[PDB]
Design a binder for this molecule. Structure first.
Ligand code: SF4
Ligand code: SF4
Lengths: 145, 169
């Protein structure tokens, strides 16, 4: 998970970084400057994680590419309402125990933390109204509320 | 044309039967109240409704009360085949027990469908051969094997291309 400037005083231990909503991992930290957009960084991360899926189990194999496509839409400014909620549901349902191995929880940890902290960039990605239906001529659509 | 078992007056008799038709409308079911004489005087029986087994004998009795010549129009899916009621208490079609001259699909048909039935029956009588008297001539009826209304209207029906879309009144 991404951590902020306030977490920089944490000792590099398993328990302290775990208590802050992240994990110590390899203890090889990566610093992100203000010139880096979080949506592009998380799009790059999820592109790696989705193409490094082993293809065995459904949530990683088929929901990491969905997060990749949502992040590409948000990076191009073509986001639509419900995208952030879809990302959060993907983060919740790819957690520990839902997938066969631990690749997908590690994949959704940065997406979780980036939405948690830098949410304004993700909401800045949303610029289009939601649509996945085109009009069929003789059929009046069911206008859901 | 083919028929299934001195000439001008035969056509005059056919014309007199054609433009003078007295119907006996049988109620039966919903087809009657959509489409709205003694059976001795009537010469056309219009059966419009379900042939329930309890009153198929009534239909057959009031058909046998009519006199020669007698024609039958069957209105609606029930009278045609049993329709949507293929069930224990329903006879599957009028033509199971009395002969039918014109069949009209619909559930119910429109009143104008009944009027078109009247036209179809009118040329059906208009080119049929019936005996002049009980002692002179051949005592057999000859119904004309007409071209089917779906074969005649095939080209104009197939030539239809576009219809109004269903989002309007
Ligand atoms: S979570 Fe692990 S087992 Fe499942 S498809 Fe991804 S890499 Fe394979
Ligand atoms: S064909 Fe339809 S409308 Fe006519 S009697 Fe039967 S159920 Fe009623």
């Amino acid at each position: 998970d991404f951590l902020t400037e306030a977490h920089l005083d944490l000792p590099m231990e398993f328990e302290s970084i775990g208590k802050a909503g992240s994990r110590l991992g390899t203890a090889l930290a990566m610093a992100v400057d203000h010139e880096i957009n979080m949506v592009s960084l998380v799009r790059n991360l999820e592109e790696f994680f989705a193409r490094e899926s082993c293809g065995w189990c459904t949530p990683c194999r088929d929901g990491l590419p969905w997060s990749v496509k949502i992040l590409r839409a948000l990076e191009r400014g073509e986001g639509q309402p419900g995208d952030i909620e879809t990302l959060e549901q993907l983060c919740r349902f790819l957690g520990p125990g839902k997938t066969f191995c631990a690749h997908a929880p590690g994949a959704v940890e940065p997406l979780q933390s980036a939405i948690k902290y830098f949410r304004e960039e993700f909401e800045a990605g949303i610029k289009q109204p939601f649509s996945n239906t085109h009009l069929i001529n003789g059929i009046q659509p069911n206008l859901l509320k | 044309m083919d028929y299934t078992l001195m000439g001008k007056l035969n056509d005059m008799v056919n014309w007199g039967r054609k433009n003078s038709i007295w119907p006996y409308n049988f109620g039966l079911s919903c087809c009657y109240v959509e489409m709205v004489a003694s059976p001795r005087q009537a010469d056309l029986m219009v059966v419009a409704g379900t042939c329930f087994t309890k009153m198929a004998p009534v239909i057959q009795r009031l058909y046998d009360q009519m006199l020669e010549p007698k024609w039958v129009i069957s209105m609606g899916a029930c009278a045609n085949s049993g329709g949507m009621y293929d069930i224990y208490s329903v006879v599957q079609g009028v033509d199971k027990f009395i002969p039918v001259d014109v069949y009209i699909p619909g559930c119910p048909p429109r009143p104008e469908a009944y009027m078109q039935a009247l036209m179809l029956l009118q040329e059906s009588i208009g080119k049929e051969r019936r005996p002049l008297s009980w002692v002179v001539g051949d005592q057999g009826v000859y119904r004309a094997n007409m071209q089917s209304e779906r074969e005649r209207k095939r080209g104009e029906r197939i030539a239809v291309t576009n219809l109004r879309t269903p989002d309007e009144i």
